[PDB]
Design a protein around this ligand. Sequence first.
Ligand SMILES: O=S(=O)(N[C@@H](c1cc2ccccc2s1)c1ccccc1Cl)c1ccc2c(c1)OCCCO2
Ligand SMILES: O=P(O)(O)OC[C@@H](O)[C@@H](O)[C@H](O)[C@@H](O)CO
Length: 585
Amino acid sequence: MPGTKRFQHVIETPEPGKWELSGYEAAVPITEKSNPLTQDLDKADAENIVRLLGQCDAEIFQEEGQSTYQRLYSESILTTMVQVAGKVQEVLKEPDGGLVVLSGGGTSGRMAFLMSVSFNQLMKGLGQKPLYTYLIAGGDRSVVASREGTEDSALHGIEELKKVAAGKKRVIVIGISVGLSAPFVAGQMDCCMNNTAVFLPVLVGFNPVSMARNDPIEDWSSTFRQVAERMQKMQEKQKAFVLNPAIGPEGLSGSSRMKGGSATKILLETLLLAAHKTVDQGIAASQRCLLEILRTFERAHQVTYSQSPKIATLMKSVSTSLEKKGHVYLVGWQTLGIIAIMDGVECIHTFGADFRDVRGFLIFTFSQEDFLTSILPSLTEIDTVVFIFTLDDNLTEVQTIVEQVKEKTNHIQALAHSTVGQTLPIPLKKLFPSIISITWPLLFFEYEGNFIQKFQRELSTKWVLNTVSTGAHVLLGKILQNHMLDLRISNSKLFWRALAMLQRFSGQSKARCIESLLRAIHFPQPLSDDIRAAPISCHVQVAHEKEQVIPIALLSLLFRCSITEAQAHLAAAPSVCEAVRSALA
Ligand SMILES: O=S(=O)(N[C@@H](c1cc2ccccc2s1)c1ccccc1Cl)c1ccc2c(c1)OCCCO2
Ligand SMILES: O=P(O)(O)OC[C@@H](O)[C@@H](O)[C@H](O)[C@@H](O)CO
């Protein structure tokens, strides 16, 4: 029948109680799993949210049990990180015709960009020509934009990679997809494998390959799973690498901007630093060099969440403000400015949030007096501003801008990074009551820019910001258990995540879930055989423009009713969350 093919790969809903025993749960990729630590995340108060998300983030450094999935500290992963450092070094010693590309979509794209800059800085500092570049689904504009639709074309990934690989002779492509999921990446990797004279593909993600996506890519013939299975075979002769440790599920299910973005930096910074440090010394990279850096990143988590109670309070001020239709501003310098901009933007697609609700500023790139005259006027008593800097920044810009903001608003707070025994100039000191200071012990550093100091702080800020943004919106009641129910379907992955959420919360069959989702999407047009048979992009393009697609589809199933009936029920309830909660009872 029509639609049987497009949905061939979908697993049937299990009958109640045999979720485990049907083998459906064992097929849910780790990156899409519900994290059991957060099954009651929607009931936690602010301090528990922080405690629960800090605990989920720490799963990154947790070791393998005794059967089970390799992890970051497993010897198969570290031995792969070594071999990859090894190949990065071959390129470092022959920079003529050599290039290192870091490519991802969404947050994997954002991460790739940061790291390409840093390692380019490092090489400038040594007087060598920069060898790093990034690639982000949707071009470079995507780095600071919410643009979830762009990851779905393989050809587009292959074009972008063909532009940048110019007339180079040895190219390392590090494709980053947390879920081993994005067709953008899949196409790059497959292309590298069709020309291993020039290309070396390295695939980075956090699912076992056996959970990689296996649904058809619209412009391509292989699935992500097949591409990855073929890379893994090539690794035996060291012509491709798959670097995929499990790091456990996300605190908010499928939200791979959190743990997944963090692990991506931890994993790649570690490995590239190791490679640079050890070329200088004319020594091969080794597990022991990687470990030093890895443990430093793991100290960084401890150091960061030891400041939890102040994180919980920044959380509340952020949540309070948005409950009143207020706005929230994130202001910081150099690379922490950017990380602020990334976090705010991600709130758009993650929570259905307006660009103004949580916006980030770099001193989007609005400098000292430009921000004073432009943004400063339009503030208000309920808003919130957050300053993010090190005590090595122009601390004179800092004090100024806060002084003016303290006039137009009082819900300020800040995030400050210091080496130990650095002190807060007394004007600045006095403007912040409960302040978030994070002091970093002395560490001896090989290079001029102190790149390891940079990485720790970027990462620690990421964790604080992500925990605040996510926590703030959970507090508002917009998350259901640990799922975001009311997402906007803007790509095929989210299409599937929606369908899985319908199977999970409805318990009804695969065919009914799918029918209800397509009706919801395409309403007011009815299911035709064309629509049943259409490629997933057709449903995505139409869902992307609508509101409450998933809750409307769920209600339809629970009440066993039409789309007309569920829509009017929804509009006759105080809110979405309210209506779904009641219906779930
Ligand atoms: O497209 S898939 O090959 N892989 C999908 C998913 C697969 C899958 C399987 C069970 C439950 C949820 C999900 S989501 C995938 C894999 C890695 C990273 C992200 C994503 Cl979306 C697929 C496989 C099976 C699916 C399914 C999708 O739709 C969801 C409902 C269950 O059936
Ligand atoms: O790295 P992946 O699995 O290929 O995910 C690619 C992007 O969709 C992902 O980063 C997404 O943008 C974020 O909103 C996840 O919270």
